[PDB]
Amino acid sequence: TTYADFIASGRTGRRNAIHD
Amino acid sequence: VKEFLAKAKEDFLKKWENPAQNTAHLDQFERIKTLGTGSFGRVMLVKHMETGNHYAMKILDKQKVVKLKQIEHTLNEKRILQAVNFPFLTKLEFSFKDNSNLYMVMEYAPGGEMFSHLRRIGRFSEPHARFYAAQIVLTFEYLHSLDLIYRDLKPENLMIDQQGYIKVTDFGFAKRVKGRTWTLCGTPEYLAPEIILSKGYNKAVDWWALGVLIYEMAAGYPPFFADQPIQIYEKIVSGKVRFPSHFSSDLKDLLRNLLQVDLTKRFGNLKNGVNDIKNHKWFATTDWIAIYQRKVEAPFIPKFKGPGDTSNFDDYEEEEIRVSINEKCGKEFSEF
Ligand SMILES: O=S(=O)(NCCNCCOCc1ccc(Cl)cc1)c1cccc2cnccc12
Q1: CB B221 to CB A17 under 8 A?
Q2: Where is this site: Important for inhibition (chain A)?
Q3: How far apart, in whole angstroms, are the C-alpha atoms of residue B99 and residue B188?
Q4: CATH architecture assigned to B1-18+113-303
Q5: Which of B13, B46, B70, B78 could share a disulfide with B29, CB 3.0–4.6 Å?
Q6: Which stretches of chain B sit within 8 Å of chain A by CB?
Q7: How many CB atoms lie within 10 A of CB B17?
Q8: Which residues of A touch B186 (CB under 8 A)?
Q9: What does the DSSP assignment read for A1-20?
Q10: How much distance in Å is there from the Cα of B170 to the middle of ligand 1?
Q11: What is the CATH number that goes with domain B19-112+304-334?
């Protein structure tokens, strides 16, 4: 499932802002 | 609305052109607990001794700000925040600086971040999602009228207050710009295709980001995710989103018009502006004035257990706040 794929991903925690 | 906004603008412009500066000092606050950390600073819960009010004090290390080329962005943050005034915006109460650091003392939300509750609970129902989204729609209408682009909508940046209403925080990328701007900034999952493809962009990227948020709130995951940012940018730029089977017809159609790569067709960006969003069928239950008034009952209210309880926040390791006996970067931050 898509939920399963998300929860298994490395990006379920707080996501950092990015900048150049 | 037009009238409200006109007067809103008069209020903003006066503070914009004559910003508050140096309205407190570090020794006026007792430092309690770290509520969040970033590359060039942290935020701590603090107590204002004179009032016994609790605040979230953002502390930025000037040298690290300078290292990361975030000087102008940081000046934008303080200058914009001191000037704005809106129910769903966290208030900047005081700002000051010392030899080492910059400080912004803002209104504390013990309810924690949306992110925390969304991840734990899994997903929000459409009405629940719709209630938050309404407050974002109104907040951007407000900010955009002042020529401000926000540039970091995400659940991590939305606080839940004691009435279960939201406060938008984190104005580090907010900018007053009348034309196009070009900085690559934001959060990967939330970036409009314009940004990724290094075009000049405008306030339409906030409307795209709104689309990402609504989706994430209602699905429980984002429309575009992968293990690495590059894989995310590919997905975003492909122009393809799959919606959960549980998404209503109206929701999907609102999201198609928000997550629209084509700017002439992206909602919020059209001839009819924010009303394209506001008069959409998904929002037909929304009383916009009652939302602004905070009269709608919140679908979820944070568990309260003290004005300075921190149980809705994660634990971070503490570190000394050290102030050098020498002034660092005085010139870079002269106007702060
Ligand atoms: O920063 S907060 O602790 N929480 C918002 C979190 N934003 C998401 C990512 O930020 C990580 C981060 C934290 C601090 C700095 Cl200086 C850089 C990056 C915060 C800010 C403003 C007002 C608040 C009111 N109450 C609680 C927390 C508040």
Answers
A1: no
A2: 11, 14-15
A3: 34
A4: Orthogonal Bundle (1.10)
A5: B46
A6: 38-39, 68-70, 73, 115, 119, 152, 154, 156, 170, 172-173, 183-189, 219-222, 225-227, 229, 242, 244
A7: 8
A8: 17-18
A9: -HHHHHHHSS-SSPPPPEE-
A10: 7
A11: 3.30.200.20
* Sequence spans of domains, chain B: 1-18+113-303, 19-112+304-334
- Structural determination approach: X-ray
* Alpha carbon nearest to ligand 1 atom 18, residue: B38
Indicate the burial class of B31 (C-beta count within 10 angstroms; 0-12, 13-18, 19 or more): middle
Q: Ligand 1: residues whose CB is within 6 Å?
A: A 14; B 35-38, 41-43, 56, 58, 90, 106, 108-109, 113, 156-157, 159, 169-170
Per DSSP (E only), the strands in chain B are 29-37, 41-48, 53-61, 92-97, 101-107, 148-149, 158-160, 166-168, 175-176, 185-186
Which distant-in-sequence residues (6+ apart) come within 8 Å of B182 by Cβ?
Answer: B198, B199, B200, B201
Active-site positions of B?
152
Whole-number Å distance between alpha carbons of B15 and B9:
10
Q: What angle do CA B259, B81, B53 make, to 5 degrees?
A: 120
Tracing tokens 């200058």 back to the chain, one arrives at: B79
